[PDB]
């Protein structure tokens, strides 16, 4: 499984009680749209929680999107123990039945919200 690398920075907010999921960029993304291109737009999903659903701007015809969209992880820090966010990148070739070319998940229970979680998580093509 390979989908490239996703550079992102997570910060916590104690005023609105949520986690600020801000991704920088994603590279090495596979192609779907005929011609060696794809329209990869990341959409965040959750487990039975389902108290959040945000889709990023459709990055048409690109293999390295740099938009840095902001996702509001609406969930109290106290509920981060039983909350695992998953980021699935969807294609939008606008013709074929484009699906999830890859995704990534991170257990917030293990991750501490002491300051900021900035890293370059590797992506995997977890087809559905």
């Amino acid at each position: 499984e390979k989908l490239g690398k996703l550079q992102y920075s997570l910060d916590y907010d104690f005023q609105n009680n949520q986690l600020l999921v801000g991704i920088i960029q994603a590279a090495e993304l596979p192609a779907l749209d005929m011609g060696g291109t794809s329209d990869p737009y990341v959409k965040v999903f959750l487990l039975p929680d389902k108290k959040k659903k945000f889709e990023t701007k459709v990055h048409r015809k690109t293999l390295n999107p740099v938009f840095n969209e902001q996702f509001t992880f609406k969930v109290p820090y106290s509920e981060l123990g039983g909350k695992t966010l998953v980021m699935a990148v969807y294609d939008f070739d606008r013709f074929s039945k484009h699906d999830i070319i890859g995704e990534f998940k991170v257990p917030m229970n293990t991750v501490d919200f002491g300051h900021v979680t900035e890293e370059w998580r590797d992506l995997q093509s977890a087809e559905k």
Binding site: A31, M34, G35, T37, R94, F95
Partner: protein
């Protein structure tokens, strides 16, 4: 005898005009291609040269110079122009092929 063949190009234009006219009489005003008519053409007899059924309006708003939702004869022909180009150009950046 009757039904005599014309010049090569004359025959070629007659064919496309016939297909154009049949689709230009789906909604109304047999001379222009409405929203459904324009989409009905590609999403039926052109799923190979141009594979796009989700963003058809993206093409319409890029071909129509008056933006009245009715591609006139000239505006409709603009599609054919880019179509003929897409068979030789395609995506001259990464993968083209045929």
């Amino acid at each position: 005898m009757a039904a005599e063949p014309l010049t090569e190009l004359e025959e070629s234009i007659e064919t496309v005009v016939t297909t154009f006219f049949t689709f230009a009489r789906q909604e109304g005003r047999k001379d222009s291609l409405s929203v459904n008519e324009f989409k009905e053409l590609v999403t039926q007899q052109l799923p190979h040269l141009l594979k796009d059924v989700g963003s058809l309006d993206e093409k319409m708003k890029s071909l129509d110079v008056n933006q009245d939702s009715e591609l006139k004869f000239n505006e409709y022909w603009r599609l054919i122009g880019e179509l003929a180009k897409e068979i030789r150009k395609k995506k001259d950046l990464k993968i083209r092929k045929k």
